[model samples]
Target: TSHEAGIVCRITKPALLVLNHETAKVIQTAFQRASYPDITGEKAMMLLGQVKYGLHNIQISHLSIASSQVELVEAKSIDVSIQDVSVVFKGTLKYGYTTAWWLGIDQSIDFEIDSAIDLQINTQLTADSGRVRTDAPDCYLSFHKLLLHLQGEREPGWIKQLFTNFISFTLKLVLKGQICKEINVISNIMADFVQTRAASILSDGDIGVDISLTGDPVITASYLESHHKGHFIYKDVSEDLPLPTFSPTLLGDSRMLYFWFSERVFHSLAKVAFQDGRLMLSLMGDEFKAVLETWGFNTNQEIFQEVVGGFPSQAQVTVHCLKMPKISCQNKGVVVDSSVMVKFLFPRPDQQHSVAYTFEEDIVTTVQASYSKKKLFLSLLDFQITPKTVSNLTESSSESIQSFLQSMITAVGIPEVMSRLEVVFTALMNSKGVSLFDIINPEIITRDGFLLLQMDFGFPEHLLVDFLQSLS
Candidate 1:
């Protein structure tokens, strides 16, 4: 079974302002799309008569927002206000008077409504069955003006006055109801869109990461943050239960953004790569010779005579892990514990002259991570190699040969393996465009039980623009 990992992302007030600027546009769209149904009702007036009227096909046009503001409330909800949202509603008003039935007084008039309104939306963020949820039950609307105009050659003065008073009140209710509903719908849509896009960014073909929220997002005076269960997903495999605890103290408040990853996440990644046969390496005879030469070792030397057995013929060397490597974080750095198998083979025409040596060993290494030149770099801080067993050698000579083998492994094998790993990891991150993000002063810190990546970032304006364009 695999253990769970998680990440925390924090956005500051200044950052929120940038986001608000873009989100206001989405709300503007919602306002325009809040199409009102025909408002049909009857209002009774003394002497004049009971008038039944219908405001048909009301649609908004010429909308403009005077100002928009967003604030965080006690780390619990987001409060947004859009002031003076002047809107024009174009529609037709049809009315009939029962008292004037004798005169057959029924009229349909084209009308336009100009309204200036202030909107306040208070939304709470909650965790909904492993996803982010938003509730905006505190939406309010205040009207500054609701003036109506009816186009006509002639109409009763009393009827126009009656509508001026009655229609304004009714229109306010209808606008508040429909527009608030549309705003809620758009808010949810935006949340889902961001969730899906974040997931897409983490996925590559069959490999992906599950970044489902672990809890409701938090808001504070200075920042908004969310927790995510950073589980590795492969081929639709079911995930193990997450760990029981996460402490806020695990992160520091000094950084603008922070991402914390449990060692279990790296362990799972290693297991998956092993399962995919990405942990194996092979070297032909000439390649092996070149490697030894680089390490300042002569294959024809006396110390290597017993191992190489007069390397005048073909040889092959292969190194691979017997099982998944265990990964853990420590104050020192990331530690890797692996059981490795190394094979040396020499093929000859005479079967008796052919030689094969197979050995198993446990290798442990501590590595520190750094970033430079737009690439992730890993350096070996310390390492230990312990030989467990060797085969295809006499018992009397095995002890001496094993000692020599361990020394050679320590001298060259570990460094070579680490170099390969650095290359692989750097390439993987580059392929994912990890460096392309506009990160500022990023720091990778290793703690007692986890890794923390903290940095500030410039908002990706183009990304938001592309997202909004897609919505249209």
Candidate 2:
């Protein structure tokens, strides 16, 4: 168990059914990639002189592996078992005989061997210095046959008998060490590869979530889960600590993958957006005119045209946060509270440009969040924007122009701001390949100070197909 980690990911048994296919191929490689030392020794002869013989440069000529099984062992490592692997081995066998002043004979023969084997390996997944680690203290290998044959049907019952009895030592001495070593190499290589990629995928443009594991992973009857310190990181920004109130009971195993986040994750993201000055939007010229038209009028109207004076580029408006927006999640949706200052940049004959008037408004908005077709949508439920203070136009106030701006802000500005939020968040995910998945009817439930993303995904068989092709 980890202390106060804000993020949790659960990969259920259903996910393993898909993962098993990819993993089985790697197991096949580990079995064949093992190294074998040359076997050399001589047996005493019966007055026909001493005999010297050896088998060297052994190789796996051809191999065929049956299917494999992967099982969750409760609180222990994941057990992987593969049986009935048929392999052919090729090597050179050299033997010689010596009879002083009688005869000297030495011969080299190429030979082929047949064998059946089984592989048993268990992987215990853990974290190593904030990254994933896999260790298998015990690796298993079984050989049902180690028969030898001389090239083309030659008769050498004496040397054949010698090689046959010589094999039992090599089984435990050479093959055991080599097979397990290769298996561990591939397993750690795989874990290391994905750990780096996951860290990269979660991050974008120097800003990303720190998915560094907080502790060892947990394995249950149905799923495997990892705890993470879900802090948003940017250069020189204060690191936000994870939430202490995260509880495991908030998640379930129905879906292939479940991602849970505490409120701190979003809050930290919004705070960074605020600091980076990414929390503001500006409307210029025609864009501002288009919005005004949506508020029940055209730009050519006497009152509206008077504000623009000469050029279409003359009228500009900027709506920016005067303070950081406070975001809170409850049962219904997200509640946003902030003070926004809107400025009118109007053209003047002498100064060329000036802020004709400015006002600060405090707003409270309720946003309904949902995901469909792999895109995030944030819809405004209802909101109230109350003017907190006003700065006059020096020639005193005019209710005629003020109410028009109020109506424009209420109707157009709110929708536009939230719309941009949706686009920005969705685009970030898209660049990270989020759209590649068919996220089935995902629900974004905003509970008190937290949120959960629960969804079943359409199993993409083509991902495996793509991987199999890419392997080429």
Candidate 3:
């Protein structure tokens, strides 16, 4: 419903789980505790400090994961389907600034960036398999889609002209070589964090998880290679199905549908509905038709246009069943805990220095996660589960009740995660940086700019593994 109302924003790929099955379980536990806002005890703080130390504050304006194909030449070596890859990255330019001085005026010019990038990987697994031998011949997540939206108002006249000329030249060099470097720094930080968490979360599962776009980025390109290394693979890819209609509406005078344009939801639903899958409508065609009729569009084509204008359309629907595990538990305060680890890998030595700096100080933080049951019983700290009103059971008779329960759990969990992330990261952002190396001890830097991060994490292991494994 939130998705249908055009509220949902981004969705990430199912990250790979590469640790031993037992370690995976431990990693899940760590993730659960780490993700929990209330339980951010000293241990949690220490681990967070380690991460913050290694990877400085790196903000992300946009991030996405989509379908891709790849050919694995060896256990750890992969040749991505270049044509199938479609990835894009766009963000702000953050770093120190400098400018030319003239007429007693100490000119100050902040950095601006515009980049396009691609990545490629060829490697072998060490005999021990402790770490894979990576040959990122052409690896870098450069600016495939770049636009450096400068902050503050632009100055005018010869001053502005002078600044522009200087900025343009400086930005060209910075974007060409540094953007990918920064992206890699962030990627490696995330990889370490995710791997640590994966070991905790899937403690004993044999799942392979990868969240990196294994290839090189082209700064001169127009868009990013969004899909690399098959990071967007789904359990049931063939189940995707398209909605009955996808169209845009006038919405008074606006041309674009700014409200509901979630590519993730669309892709997920399409994965289930098309491909010969039955259409389990969340809002029936007739009911949706009635709403459209009132809006003046009566035909299917008209309805489609109104719902899914020129932009993408998405929906958040819960699939209900009768025989599966009911999400509504009797215990009001039962904590249904679970965890997820998002993996990231950096380019190799040859790939460094090209665009590696951009990845430096990479910030990986949660955007949103929430519960969306009709009753909305789940609470963040209390872990409370409220029952839905009986009258709200419109489609309680569906055959796949378990799917519905799972959906409800997912809905609630996502929102909860989102909230927790905001709180946790905000606290970290405000805190002073923890030194990774003692070389700069006397002068401490805030965890906002370039840095490196590393550390292991622990969690409330027992609760998380039991809860997730129960799903299977």
Candidate 4:
């Protein structure tokens, strides 16, 4: 329960099964990009004095694959078995022999080599300094057919015999060494790509979440979970504010992706938002009049005129959070408790203008959250407002003014604020390119001290296209 991870990402076996569906892409890439060293060897023949042969510029001319099968070896490794891989290699062969030391002989021949192979690679996923990496220690390949054919068929019969008898071992060694090493290299490249992209998705400007790992990744037969410190950081500092504990069995494996966040993450976000003056809004002149007009109160209403003692005058309204908002999650939803002061300021060039009316109030709001089309929606369940002050007015006509004010705030103020919050949140996310993709059947559940997000996300076509294009 004393888990230090402020956020956790759990990917289940079903997700991994689907992940393996794209194995052909990575395998083909590795096969194409692998560098094969030139095969060189020397032989001393009894009849033909001495022969030196070398295969140079070995390149893959044709390739076919049946894809790698992925299996999670409990907490040990991810095993991939590739079968029926048919590859044709094209290279130039240089053969030279010292015939009686009287004449120098060097001939260049074009050769085509064919091989059918099966490979198995075992890779273990690891977390180092918040990055996901791969370590592949077990790799094996079986060669079924390795045949060499010279282009002109004008070779001495002994050439084929020498190569078949002695050089086949070098072919197998180079193929295994380069191809297996390529898989291991590209395996970690993809891992680092995902880890880096995920961090960038959760960051912007100077304010971002520190998603550094708190523990090694956990992999079971059912799922693999990564723990992250979801602490909020500004510039350079991450404050160790109070955070709630976590539950081990809080997640299920039905969804492809799941995110669990402690409420403290939200608390720190609100505090910094207020400190940055982002939690303030002002509706001036026409906007203020419209809020009143839409709420069944006219701008020239007799009550408004009596309260502010003006006629044919523009209205100004400002609402700002006085302090950090307090937030928590319960069965109902996210409860937002904030103290805000709403004021009607007289439009004046000087700062010392008297207020038309000011209402200092504390509001408690319960919100249910939803995400669709890359936009956030908050539906209010119920709310309570407690008035702390009614200043700049006497008690003679205070009741009418106070009663009218309550209805406008409950009706127009809260709803507008909620709507604006949705727009701003979506705008920020969309600006960060979140709008390019989508989520399926997303569910946000609020529980005791935490919230869970479960969803299925389809892979975008061009997102990986750009990544793979940059690989080679």
Q: What TM-scores do the predictions have?
A: 0.76, 0.85, 0.22, 0.89
lDDT of each: 0.76, 0.75, 0.27, 0.79
Worst 10 residues of 3 by lDDT: 354-363
Q: Write the per-residue lDDT of candidate 1 for residues 349-465, one digit (tens) a residue.
A: 665565667879899999998876676677789988777887864323456666665676788888778777778767777776566667777888887778888877666766765
TM-score of 3: 0.22
Cα RMSD, each candidate: 5.6, 3.8, 30.4, 3.4
Candidate 3: give its CA RMSD in angstroms.
30.4
Q: Which stretches of candidate 4 lie over 4 Å from their true place?
A: 1-3, 100-105, 240-244, 287-314, 346-355, 393-397
* 1-472: candidate 2 lDDT, tens digit per residue: 3356877788888777767765656766675667787887777655555677788889988877777788888888888887887878898988787443254568789988888888788889998988878998778888888777888767545665665566655654587788778788878876776677677677766467787788888888788888888888877354755355556678887878888877777777777778778778788888877766765666688866655544566677888889888888777788888789988767666553443668799989988888887788998887988898867554533776677667667777887777778988799778876787788878888889877888777656676455433432
**Ranking of all predicted structures according to TM-score, beginning with the best and ending with the worst:** 4, 2, 1, 3
Q: What TM-score does model 1 achieve against the real structure?
A: 0.76
Q: What is the lDDT of candidate 1?
A: 0.76
Ranking by lDDT: 4, 1, 2, 3
Backbone clashes in model 1: 1
Candidate 3 deviant stretches above 4 angstroms: 1-62, 65-68, 74-76, 80-104, 109-116, 128-137, 140-142, 152-472
Candidate 2: residue 464 lDDT (0-100): 46
Q: Write the per-residue lDDT of candidate 4 for residues 338-386, one digit (tens) a residue.
A: 9998876553334444336688889999999999877899999989999
**Candidate 2, which ten residues in sequence have the lowest lDDT sum?**
463-472
